Ligand binder design. Structure first.
Ligand SMILES: Nc1cccc2c1C(=O)N([C@H]1CCC(=O)NC1=O)C2=O
Ligand SMILES: [Zn+2]
Length: 105
């Protein structure tokens, strides 16, 4: 249980080693304006995604950061968001825990 894959298809996405304690905890539970609750795990790094469009600050869960939707690059499943434009770090990924599968490298 060291690498994270897309639950829907298997695409390699991230690694346990790349978890990022933002504000002291890698896990942040948040809601969007449609009321959907997400258990977001922050990662300093991820691969295998497709980052869609240009960034937006609207509704951002992380102060100082703008977001882009992050899809699985293989199957299109919405896996989370890429955050940029901030500070320490300038960028990171916020991925929806239950949309990944954990397993051996
Ligand atoms: N405006 C809408 C409308 C529908 C769904 C979402 C947003 C929205 O902003 N986010 C996220 C994007 C990422 C973020 O940081 N905050 C959000 O509320 C959504 O899931
Ligand atoms: Zn996928």
């Amino acid at each position: 249980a060291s690498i994270f894959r897309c639950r829907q298809c298997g695409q390699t996405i991230s690694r346990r080693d790349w978890l990022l304690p933002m504000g002291g905890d890698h896990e942040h539970v948040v809601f969007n304006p449609a009321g959907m609750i997400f258990r977001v795990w922050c990662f300093s790094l991820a691969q295998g995604l497709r980052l869609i469009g240009a960034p937006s600050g609207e509704f951002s869960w992380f102060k100082g950061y703008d977001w882009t939707i992050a899809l699985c690059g293989q199957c299109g499943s919405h896996l989370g968001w890429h955050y940029e434009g901030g500070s320490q770090p300038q960028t990171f990924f916020g991925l929806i825990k239950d949309r990944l599968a954990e397993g051996p490298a």
